[PDB]
Structure formats: structure tokens, C-alpha cells
């Protein structure tokens, strides 16, 4: 439900900036804009995987909305990927969002 993935990323978004993440522009910077997304939204890769990727909110949001697939690995765009904050916490050493909540 296209609607129901439009209220999630409009509520389910945050604040991402360096000073609140703590993570490098880069780690933290959206693949669509590519640039700081200052209020954007952890949203997986691919749902039935660990990798979790950080986006733009109104970016990924209009991108849905286009009835696009999805940016990186052109899966169908759900709800179901659309995940919290403690889900995905930026570890250096794998240099992507891993999963705290599955």
C-alpha cells in the first residue's frame, strides 16, 4: 500500500545530520541526492537481508510515489523495508547499517 508507505516515511523519518548520527556526511548521505539528507529515513537495501541503508525522506518518498523500483537493487518498494531507527546503527567496520530489533 503506496499510501500507507507515504505516511511511514512522513512520521518513521528523523533528523540526519553528523551531530545527531555521529557517523561521517557520507556514511549517513543519501544515494538519491547524494547529499546530506538533513531529515530523511532508515529504509533496507532488500527486505529478507541485514543491510539497511539510510535515504532522503521526501526523496525516497516522491520515488515511491513515481511507482519506481527500488534505487539500489530495483526490489519491489514496501512498507516492509521501511524500518526504526534502532534497526539500523551505522557499524564502520562492515561500512552499512546492521540490524538491532530482528
Do not use: A, D, G
Given at each position: 500500500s503506496q499510501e500507507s508507505i507515504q505516511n511511514k516515511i512522513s512520521q518513521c523519518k528523523?533528523?540526519?545530520c553528523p551531530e545527531r548520527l555521529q557517523c561521517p556526511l557520507e556514511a549517513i548521505q543519501?544515494?538519491?541526492?547524494?547529499?546530506?539528507?538533513e531529515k530523511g529515513i532508515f529504509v533496507k537495501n532488500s527486505d529478507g537481508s541485514d543491510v539497511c541503508t539510510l535515504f532522503d525522506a521526501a526523496a525516497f518518498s516522491r520515488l515511491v510515489g513515481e511507482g519506481?523500483?527500488?534505487?539500489?537493487?530495483r526490489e519491489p518498494i514496501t512498507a516492509s523495508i521501511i524500518v526504526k531507527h534502532e534497526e539500523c546503527i551505522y557499524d564502520d567496520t562492515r561500512g552499512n547499517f546492521i540490524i538491532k530489533g530482528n
Open positions: 528523523f533528523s540526519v543519501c544515494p538519491i541526492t547524494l547529499e546530506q539528507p519506481l523500483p527500488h534505487p539500489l537493487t
